Structure 1
Amino acid sequence: AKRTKKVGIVGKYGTRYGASLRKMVKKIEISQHAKYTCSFCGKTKMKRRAVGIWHCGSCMKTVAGGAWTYNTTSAVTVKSAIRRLKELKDQ
């Protein structure tokens, strides 16, 4: 059955810290504990070892990722930007 109506994972904190902070941290708690698909092997095993460090239990490949998400929007934008400049550097 559905046990909570809205708190979800942040139900571990009971009534403490205020609704808005619990609401805000709920997005991170889900993301930082999710298992992401590993781009190197495909098994849904990529898990966070520490803040910024993401490890896959299948192929053992460790990746420097985001604090709470596997890759950040800023980092993904920079990779495309660095790709384009490289092409326009060597044509």
Structure 2
Amino acid sequence: AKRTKKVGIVGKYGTRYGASLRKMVKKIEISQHAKYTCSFCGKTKMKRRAVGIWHCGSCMKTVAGGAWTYNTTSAVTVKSAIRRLKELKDQ
């Protein structure tokens, strides 16, 4: 059965720290403890080891990513921008 109406993962924090703070940390905790699909082996076994460090249990590949997400929007846009600068340099 459904156990909580809205708190979900931050039900561990009880009544403490304030509703807005629990709501803010809920999304980060979900993304931080979620298992992503490894882009090297295709398995959903890439999970966070430490802050910024993402390890795949299957292919044993370690990636430097974001603090809570596997990769950050700034990193993705920057990688695309660097790829465009390199293709302009070659062209």
TM-score range, shorter chain: over 0.9
Residue 74 of structure 2: aligned partner: 74
Runs of 4+ more than 4 Å apart: none
Query: What do the CA deviations read for 1:53-81 (whole angstroms, capped 9, x no partner)?
Result: 00000000000000000000000000000
CA RMSD across the alignment: 0.3
Partner SS state of residue 36, structure 1 = coil
Question: d(CA) in 2 for partners of 1:64 and 1:28?
Answer: 18
Question: d(CA) in 2 for partners of 1:31 and 1:15?
Answer: 22
Question: d(CA) in 2 for partners of 1:7 and 1:57?
Answer: 30
Provide TM-score, normalisation by structure 1: 0.99
Q: CA deviation at 1:43?
A: 0.6
Question: d(CA) in 2 for partners of 1:90 and 1:29?
Answer: 42
Unaligned 5+ residue runs, structure 1?
none
* Greater strand share, structure number: 1
Query: What do the CA deviations read for 1:15-72 (whole angstroms, capped 9, x no partner)?
Result: 0000000000000000000000000000100000000000000000000000000000
Aligned residues: 91
Q: CA deviation at 1:5?
A: 0.3
Unaligned 5+ residue runs, structure 2?
none
Residue 41 of structure 2: aligned partner: 41
Q: CA deviation at 1:90?
A: 1.3
Q: How high is the sequence identity, in percent, across the aligned residues?
A: 100
